[PDB]
Structures are given as C-alpha cells and as structure tokens.
Amino acid sequence: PSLPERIDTFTELFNYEVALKSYDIRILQSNYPTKLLSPDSLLPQTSDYPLKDIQQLYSLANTCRGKLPLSPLITEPLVFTRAICKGTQLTPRWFSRSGLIHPGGGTYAARYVEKYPELRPKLAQYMHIKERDNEEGDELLESLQNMDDDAINALIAGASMFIEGKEMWLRRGDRYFVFSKDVWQENVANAGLSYTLASQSKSCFVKRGNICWDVE
C-alpha cells in the first residue's frame, strides 16, 4: 500500500477513547493565538518597520521625549511606548486587539507587567507562553511550554499529527488526542510504517507535522 495510505491506516488503529488526554481545538486556538506560541515572536521584529521610525521609537522609550515617528505603520508601538512614558493605563481590551508582539521581541503585555507587576494575573493571557511562569499550575499551558520548536510549530500549523517528547498528538475532528508510546509505536509497526523526527531526518520525503514517515 502507498505511504499516504499507510498513514491513513495508522490513524485508524487508535481507539480515541484511550487517549491520555485531549483538547478542543477551537478553545486552544481562542486561548493561544499563533503569535503567543510561535518561537519567532520572541525574536526582534524591528525589520517589519521603517528604520527611522524604529530609531525614533527607541529614543522615545529611552528618554520619553523627542520627535514622533511619522509612519502609520508604527501606531501600536508608539501608543505603547508613550503609555509607559506617561503612566497611561492600557486595558486588557487594548492588548487583546493589538498585534501582541513588541518590535523588540516578546509581548507588549510582558513589558507592561514588568513595569506594573500587580497586573500579571490580569494580563498573563496576552503574554507569550515562554514569558509565563505558570504560577496557576495550568496543565495545558505547561504542556504547550514543554514543546520544542518543531512540535509547537506543527501545532501552530494545525498538523494532522506530531510527536511531543514520548507522546503523539493526533488531530481527529474538533480535538487533538494525546497517546502514550506504548500505543502509538505499536500502531506505527502495525500500519507497516517507520518514522524519524524531522530534526533527525536526513531525507524527509513524506512529512506530517514533525514526523518523517517511511515504510517499515
């Protein structure tokens, strides 16, 4: 049987009621916007802006005075930077409607809570998962925080499947189901498959998520 056919067989060998746990995808997406999951959100974003505007923004952040950047492209970072300077309240709705990510990398919310620590509980949901200490002991948040780049990027892409450490996540219907290796590795073998992780593969001809599939 063809490789895509064997991969279909594989997904059919699971009893989705034996999953270790599952998550509703719609709720995951509403709670964790792509930008709060992506590794690249932590890196500087200054390249998406005119250089002169970024230079003026840094001067404003560093001194709270000077000439104001004229690009319409810099409105949100300008409003944020001026708010810090002038002690202006930024509401949860402001963060929720924003682009979330500060030009310097990381989130508006994380910088705001660094200035006003009392707001950490109210604004945590607008911070990047890697900026959060999980003081709440939230199981899904902790699960997401433990994913390496290739796994979290598979999740961001809505991949049909991906390996997370020793567990496999499988999309079925409106949920992701998580299975133990006792189950999923047996099903690999019984579907007539073998696999390598994308980060380990030297040739990844048939890719799903971070999984490089081949025949057994």
Side-chain angles (χ1 to χ4, degrees), residues 18-36:
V18 320
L20 306 172
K21 57 192 185 164
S22 61
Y23 300 105
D24 180 285
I25 287 165
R26 197 191 59 78
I27 290 173
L28 200 155
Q29 287 172 351
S30 68
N31 279 323
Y32 298 99
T34 289
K35 288 173 172 196
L36 301 188

PDB file of all heavy atoms in Angstrom, residues 18-36:
ATOM      1  N   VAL A  18      -8.979   5.871  24.379  1.00  0.00           N
ATOM      2  CA  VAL A  18      -7.875   5.518  25.262  1.00  0.00           C
ATOM      3  C   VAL A  18      -6.829   6.606  25.304  1.00  0.00           C
ATOM      4  O   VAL A  18      -5.753   6.413  25.895  1.00  0.00           O
ATOM      5  CB  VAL A  18      -7.241   4.164  24.896  1.00  0.00           C
ATOM      6  CG1 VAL A  18      -8.319   3.170  24.511  1.00  0.00           C
ATOM      7  CG2 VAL A  18      -6.180   4.301  23.807  1.00  0.00           C
ATOM      8  N   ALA A  19      -7.121   7.774  24.720  1.00  0.00           N
ATOM      9  CA  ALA A  19      -6.141   8.829  24.753  1.00  0.00           C
ATOM     10  C   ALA A  19      -5.834   9.183  26.198  1.00  0.00           C
ATOM     11  O   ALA A  19      -6.690   9.070  27.090  1.00  0.00           O
ATOM     12  CB  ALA A  19      -6.648  10.047  23.992  1.00  0.00           C
ATOM     13  N   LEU A  20      -4.585   9.573  26.433  1.00  0.00           N
ATOM     14  CA  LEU A  20      -4.211  10.076  27.750  1.00  0.00           C
ATOM     15  C   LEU A  20      -5.010  11.314  28.102  1.00  0.00           C
ATOM     16  O   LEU A  20      -5.394  11.517  29.263  1.00  0.00           O
ATOM     17  CB  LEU A  20      -2.729  10.416  27.785  1.00  0.00           C
ATOM     18  CG  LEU A  20      -1.784   9.307  27.368  1.00  0.00           C
ATOM     19  CD1 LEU A  20      -0.388   9.912  27.290  1.00  0.00           C
ATOM     20  CD2 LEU A  20      -1.826   8.156  28.350  1.00  0.00           C
ATOM     21  N   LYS A  21      -5.248  12.161  27.108  1.00  0.00           N
ATOM     22  CA  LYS A  21      -5.945  13.426  27.295  1.00  0.00           C
ATOM     23  C   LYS A  21      -6.285  13.943  25.907  1.00  0.00           C
ATOM     24  O   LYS A  21      -5.752  13.465  24.899  1.00  0.00           O
ATOM     25  CB  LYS A  21      -5.091  14.430  28.045  1.00  0.00           C
ATOM     26  CG  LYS A  21      -3.769  14.711  27.364  1.00  0.00           C
ATOM     27  CD  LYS A  21      -2.846  15.494  28.290  1.00  0.00           C
ATOM     28  CE  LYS A  21      -1.561  15.895  27.556  1.00  0.00           C
ATOM     29  NZ  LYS A  21      -0.855  16.957  28.320  1.00  0.00           N
ATOM     30  N   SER A  22      -7.179  14.923  25.863  1.00  0.00           N
ATOM     31  CA  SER A  22      -7.471  15.573  24.596  1.00  0.00           C
ATOM     32  C   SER A  22      -7.827  17.031  24.835  1.00  0.00           C
ATOM     33  O   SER A  22      -8.178  17.447  25.944  1.00  0.00           O
ATOM     34  CB  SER A  22      -8.605  14.882  23.847  1.00  0.00           C
ATOM     35  OG  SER A  22      -9.802  14.907  24.605  1.00  0.00           O
ATOM     36  N   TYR A  23      -7.777  17.798  23.756  1.00  0.00           N
ATOM     37  CA  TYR A  23      -8.041  19.231  23.846  1.00  0.00           C
ATOM     38  C   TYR A  23      -8.915  19.658  22.685  1.00  0.00           C
ATOM     39  O   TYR A  23      -8.669  19.275  21.541  1.00  0.00           O
ATOM     40  CB  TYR A  23      -6.747  20.049  23.823  1.00  0.00           C
ATOM     41  CG  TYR A  23      -5.801  19.724  24.951  1.00  0.00           C
ATOM     42  CD1 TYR A  23      -4.653  18.970  24.708  1.00  0.00           C
ATOM     43  CD2 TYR A  23      -6.041  20.170  26.240  1.00  0.00           C
ATOM     44  CE1 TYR A  23      -3.760  18.665  25.730  1.00  0.00           C
ATOM     45  CE2 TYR A  23      -5.156  19.865  27.276  1.00  0.00           C
ATOM     46  CZ  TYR A  23      -4.016  19.125  27.007  1.00  0.00           C
ATOM     47  OH  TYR A  23      -3.140  18.822  28.026  1.00  0.00           O
ATOM     48  N   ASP A  24      -9.917  20.485  22.987  1.00  0.00           N
ATOM     49  CA  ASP A  24     -10.752  21.067  21.946  1.00  0.00           C
ATOM     50  C   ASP A  24      -9.943  22.098  21.156  1.00  0.00           C
ATOM     51  O   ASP A  24      -9.325  22.992  21.738  1.00  0.00           O
ATOM     52  CB  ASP A  24     -11.982  21.707  22.598  1.00  0.00           C
ATOM     53  CG  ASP A  24     -12.915  22.354  21.601  1.00  0.00           C
ATOM     54  OD1 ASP A  24     -12.590  23.439  21.093  1.00  0.00           O
ATOM     55  OD2 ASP A  24     -13.982  21.778  21.330  1.00  0.00           O
ATOM     56  N   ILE A  25      -9.949  21.979  19.827  1.00  0.00           N
ATOM     57  CA  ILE A  25      -9.047  22.791  19.008  1.00  0.00           C
ATOM     58  C   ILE A  25      -9.503  24.245  18.976  1.00  0.00           C
ATOM     59  O   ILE A  25      -8.684  25.169  19.059  1.00  0.00           O
ATOM     60  CB  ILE A  25      -8.941  22.207  17.590  1.00  0.00           C
ATOM     61  CG1 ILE A  25      -8.112  20.920  17.625  1.00  0.00           C
ATOM     62  CG2 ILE A  25      -8.352  23.223  16.611  1.00  0.00           C
ATOM     63  CD1 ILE A  25      -8.263  20.114  16.374  1.00  0.00           C
ATOM     64  N   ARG A  26     -10.806  24.463  18.829  1.00  0.00           N
ATOM     65  CA  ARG A  26     -11.346  25.819  18.837  1.00  0.00           C
ATOM     66  C   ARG A  26     -10.963  26.558  20.117  1.00  0.00           C
ATOM     67  O   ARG A  26     -10.574  27.740  20.077  1.00  0.00           O
ATOM     68  CB  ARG A  26     -12.868  25.754  18.667  1.00  0.00           C
ATOM     69  CG  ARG A  26     -13.489  27.067  18.264  1.00  0.00           C
ATOM     70  CD  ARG A  26     -14.992  26.987  18.378  1.00  0.00           C
ATOM     71  NE  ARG A  26     -15.383  26.675  19.747  1.00  0.00           N
ATOM     72  CZ  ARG A  26     -15.392  27.562  20.737  1.00  0.00           C
ATOM     73  NH1 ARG A  26     -15.035  28.824  20.511  1.00  0.00           N
ATOM     74  NH2 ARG A  26     -15.754  27.184  21.956  1.00  0.00           N
ATOM     75  N   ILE A  27     -11.072  25.881  21.266  1.00  0.00           N
ATOM     76  CA  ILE A  27     -10.750  26.529  22.533  1.00  0.00           C
ATOM     77  C   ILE A  27      -9.248  26.760  22.647  1.00  0.00           C
ATOM     78  O   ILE A  27      -8.806  27.819  23.112  1.00  0.00           O
ATOM     79  CB  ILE A  27     -11.313  25.712  23.711  1.00  0.00           C
ATOM     80  CG1 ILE A  27     -12.842  25.811  23.709  1.00  0.00           C
ATOM     81  CG2 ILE A  27     -10.718  26.195  25.032  1.00  0.00           C
ATOM     82  CD1 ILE A  27     -13.523  24.935  24.710  1.00  0.00           C
ATOM     83  N   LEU A  28      -8.433  25.781  22.223  1.00  0.00           N
ATOM     84  CA  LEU A  28      -6.993  26.007  22.166  1.00  0.00           C
ATOM     85  C   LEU A  28      -6.664  27.224  21.310  1.00  0.00           C
ATOM     86  O   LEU A  28      -5.866  28.078  21.711  1.00  0.00           O
ATOM     87  CB  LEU A  28      -6.286  24.758  21.645  1.00  0.00           C
ATOM     88  CG  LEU A  28      -4.797  24.679  21.985  1.00  0.00           C
ATOM     89  CD1 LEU A  28      -4.380  23.218  21.992  1.00  0.00           C
ATOM     90  CD2 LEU A  28      -3.977  25.439  20.955  1.00  0.00           C
ATOM     91  N   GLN A  29      -7.312  27.359  20.156  1.00  0.00           N
ATOM     92  CA  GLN A  29      -6.972  28.466  19.267  1.00  0.00           C
ATOM     93  C   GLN A  29      -7.395  29.801  19.861  1.00  0.00           C
ATOM     94  O   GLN A  29      -6.667  30.795  19.747  1.00  0.00           O
ATOM     95  CB  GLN A  29      -7.614  28.260  17.896  1.00  0.00           C
ATOM     96  CG  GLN A  29      -6.944  27.167  17.076  1.00  0.00           C
ATOM     97  CD  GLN A  29      -7.716  26.837  15.800  1.00  0.00           C
ATOM     98  OE1 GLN A  29      -8.846  27.299  15.600  1.00  0.00           O
ATOM     99  NE2 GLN A  29      -7.110  26.032  14.938  1.00  0.00           N
ATOM    100  N   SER A  30      -8.556  29.847  20.512  1.00  0.00           N
ATOM    101  CA  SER A  30      -9.002  31.121  21.078  1.00  0.00           C
ATOM    102  C   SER A  30      -8.135  31.535  22.261  1.00  0.00           C
ATOM    103  O   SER A  30      -7.864  32.729  22.450  1.00  0.00           O
ATOM    104  CB  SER A  30     -10.469  31.041  21.495  1.00  0.00           C
ATOM    105  OG  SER A  30     -10.638  30.170  22.593  1.00  0.00           O
ATOM    106  N   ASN A  31      -7.711  30.570  23.078  1.00  0.00           N
ATOM    107  CA  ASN A  31      -6.872  30.853  24.241  1.00  0.00           C
ATOM    108  C   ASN A  31      -5.419  31.139  23.876  1.00  0.00           C
ATOM    109  O   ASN A  31      -4.744  31.892  24.593  1.00  0.00           O
ATOM    110  CB  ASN A  31      -6.909  29.677  25.219  1.00  0.00           C
ATOM    111  CG  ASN A  31      -8.127  29.692  26.101  1.00  0.00           C
ATOM    112  OD1 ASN A  31      -8.583  30.747  26.524  1.00  0.00           O
ATOM    113  ND2 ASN A  31      -8.650  28.513  26.404  1.00  0.00           N
ATOM    114  N   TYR A  32      -4.901  30.539  22.809  1.00  0.00           N
ATOM    115  CA  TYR A  32      -3.488  30.672  22.447  1.00  0.00           C
ATOM    116  C   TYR A  32      -3.346  31.094  20.993  1.00  0.00           C
ATOM    117  O   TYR A  32      -3.047  30.266  20.124  1.00  0.00           O
ATOM    118  CB  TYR A  32      -2.716  29.379  22.727  1.00  0.00           C
ATOM    119  CG  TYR A  32      -2.757  29.052  24.189  1.00  0.00           C
ATOM    120  CD1 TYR A  32      -3.659  28.121  24.691  1.00  0.00           C
ATOM    121  CD2 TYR A  32      -1.921  29.710  25.079  1.00  0.00           C
ATOM    122  CE1 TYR A  32      -3.707  27.839  26.056  1.00  0.00           C
ATOM    123  CE2 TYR A  32      -1.965  29.456  26.425  1.00  0.00           C
ATOM    124  CZ  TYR A  32      -2.852  28.530  26.914  1.00  0.00           C
ATOM    125  OH  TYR A  32      -2.865  28.302  28.264  1.00  0.00           O
ATOM    126  N   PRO A  33      -3.522  32.388  20.700  1.00  0.00           N
ATOM    127  CA  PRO A  33      -3.188  32.901  19.364  1.00  0.00           C
ATOM    128  C   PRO A  33      -1.802  32.446  18.921  1.00  0.00           C
ATOM    129  O   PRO A  33      -0.868  32.375  19.724  1.00  0.00           O
ATOM    130  CB  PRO A  33      -3.232  34.424  19.542  1.00  0.00           C
ATOM    131  CG  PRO A  33      -4.020  34.684  20.769  1.00  0.00           C
ATOM    132  CD  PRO A  33      -3.919  33.448  21.641  1.00  0.00           C
ATOM    133  N   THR A  34      -1.678  32.162  17.617  1.00  0.00           N
ATOM    134  CA  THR A  34      -0.407  31.810  16.982  1.00  0.00           C
ATOM    135  C   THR A  34       0.769  32.639  17.498  1.00  0.00           C
ATOM    136  O   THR A  34       1.851  32.113  17.774  1.00  0.00           O
ATOM    137  CB  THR A  34      -0.521  32.005  15.463  1.00  0.00           C
ATOM    138  OG1 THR A  34      -1.376  31.003  14.898  1.00  0.00           O
ATOM    139  CG2 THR A  34       0.851  31.948  14.800  1.00  0.00           C
ATOM    140  N   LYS A  35       0.573  33.952  17.618  1.00  0.00           N
ATOM    141  CA  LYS A  35       1.697  34.797  17.993  1.00  0.00           C
ATOM    142  C   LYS A  35       2.177  34.537  19.414  1.00  0.00           C
ATOM    143  O   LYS A  35       3.334  34.836  19.727  1.00  0.00           O
ATOM    144  CB  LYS A  35       1.324  36.265  17.844  1.00  0.00           C
ATOM    145  CG  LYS A  35       1.203  36.729  16.399  1.00  0.00           C
ATOM    146  CD  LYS A  35       0.672  38.131  16.383  1.00  0.00           C
ATOM    147  CE  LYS A  35       0.714  38.717  14.992  1.00  0.00           C
ATOM    148  NZ  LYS A  35       0.552  40.193  15.072  1.00  0.00           N
ATOM    149  N   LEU A  36       1.329  33.988  20.283  1.00  0.00           N
ATOM    150  CA  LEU A  36       1.748  33.695  21.649  1.00  0.00           C
ATOM    151  C   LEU A  36       2.361  32.303  21.763  1.00  0.00           C
ATOM    152  O   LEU A  36       2.779  31.894  22.854  1.00  0.00           O
ATOM    153  CB  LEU A  36       0.554  33.861  22.596  1.00  0.00           C
ATOM    154  CG  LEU A  36      -0.063  35.270  22.583  1.00  0.00           C
ATOM    155  CD1 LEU A  36      -1.108  35.454  23.681  1.00  0.00           C
ATOM    156  CD2 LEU A  36       1.033  36.322  22.699  1.00  0.00           C
TER     157      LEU A  36
END
